[PDB]
């Protein structure tokens, strides 16, 4: 923090964190080499247009104009897509992006937000890098459409997730499908967890990594990121969403009780016995595994309590 990048990078040369190298003194850690076969920088933009029609639409929606379009295609190339034989998947790029974005967003909140405590600050770092919020941001800008992927299940999850998000108006929330009490009225109060696919966040992050590799200007990249995430930055600076379960246990009047998960086929659910305004409401969570079912129940309870307190 004190000495900035081009200087404190050499701190690792001092500490041998990453082994000192005369060829690459640690001070020069911003020299990323995406060597290997995974990338090619020679394909004409015509092939990518054949893979990416309506380029201008995507450019203006993203808010940055690209120069070498191949970076786009390699970033949008989901590994399952077979007919792209010029570039690799996005995994190696999201690997670097995730860190890049964490650093940039953390730097922004550090510089601008000096009134908010470090513990909730790390919680906020975790929530912002969380794939859920990143996926919400991605869908809000409709980038999911162009992703070049060739598997049913991921497409289907994307479809239902965007449907639910639109029903929520592109607002991050407890990702719960309230199946019954607009929910209809029934005997009890049960729901399921809207599952967030991770490929969406992965592709957004790899796209940002492509931006970095293309422009090689980090101020412009931060301009893009700020434009994209400004609403969430303004919001989370007013409320800090900690882990949902930990939110309940700290919340004074939650006191949820989770029953044993009973197994039928591949489905398992947990009976969440809690109380609200001195009356006991029996809510239940569902999932593929025990932890997922517990999280579903907790998210449903926080949903119910949000409607009750507001």
């Amino acid at each position: 923090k004190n000495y900035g990048l081009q200087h404190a990078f050499k701190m690792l040369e001092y500490f041998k964190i990453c082994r000192a190298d005369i060829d690459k003194p640690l001070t020069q850690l911003l020299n990323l080499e995406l060597g290997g076969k995974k990338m090619r920088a020679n394909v004409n933009t015509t092939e990518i247009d054949g893979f990416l029609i309506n380029h201008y639409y995507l450019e203006k929606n993203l808010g940055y104009t690209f120069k070498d379009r191949r970076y786009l295609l390699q970033a949008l190339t989901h590994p399952s897509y077979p007919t792209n034989r010029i570039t690799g998947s996005y995994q190696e790029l999201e690997f670097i992006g995730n860190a890049i974005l964490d650093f940039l967003i953390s730097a922004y909140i550090f510089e601008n937000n000096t009134k908010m405590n470090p513990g909730a600050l790390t919680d906020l770092r975790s929530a912002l890098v969380n794939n859920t919020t990143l996926a919400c941001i991605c869908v809000r800008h409709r980038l999911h459409f162009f992703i070049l992927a060739e598997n049913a299940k991921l497409s289907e999850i994307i479809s239902k997730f965007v449907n639910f998000q639109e029903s929520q108006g592109h607002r991050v929330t407890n990702y719960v499908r309230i199946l019954l009490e607009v929910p209809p009225k029934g005997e009890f109060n049960m729901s399921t967890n809207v599952d967030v696919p991770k490929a969406l966040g992965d592709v957004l992050e790899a796209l940002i990594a492509a931006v970095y590799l293309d422009c090689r200007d980090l101020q412009r990249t931060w301009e893009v990121i700020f434009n994209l995430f400004e609403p969430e930055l303004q919001e989370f600076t007013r409320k800090v969403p900690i882990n949902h379960i930990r939110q309940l246990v700290e919340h004074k009047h939650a006191k949820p009780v989770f029953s044993s998960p009973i197994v039928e086929g591949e489905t398992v659910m947990v009976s969440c016995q809690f109380t609200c305004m001195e009356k006991t409401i029996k809510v239940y969570g569902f999932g593929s595994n025990k932890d997922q079912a517990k999280l579903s129940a907790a998210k449903h309870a926080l949903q119910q309590l949000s409607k009750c307190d507001a």
């Binding site: 900035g4 730097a107 510089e111 601008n112 101020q219 931060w222």
Partner: peptide
């Protein structure tokens, strides 16, 4: 409108 030039960024560039 105008982004605050990020102090880390404005520092590593100047």
């Amino acid at each position: 409108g105008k982004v605050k030039p990020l102090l880390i960024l404005q520092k590593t560039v100047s």
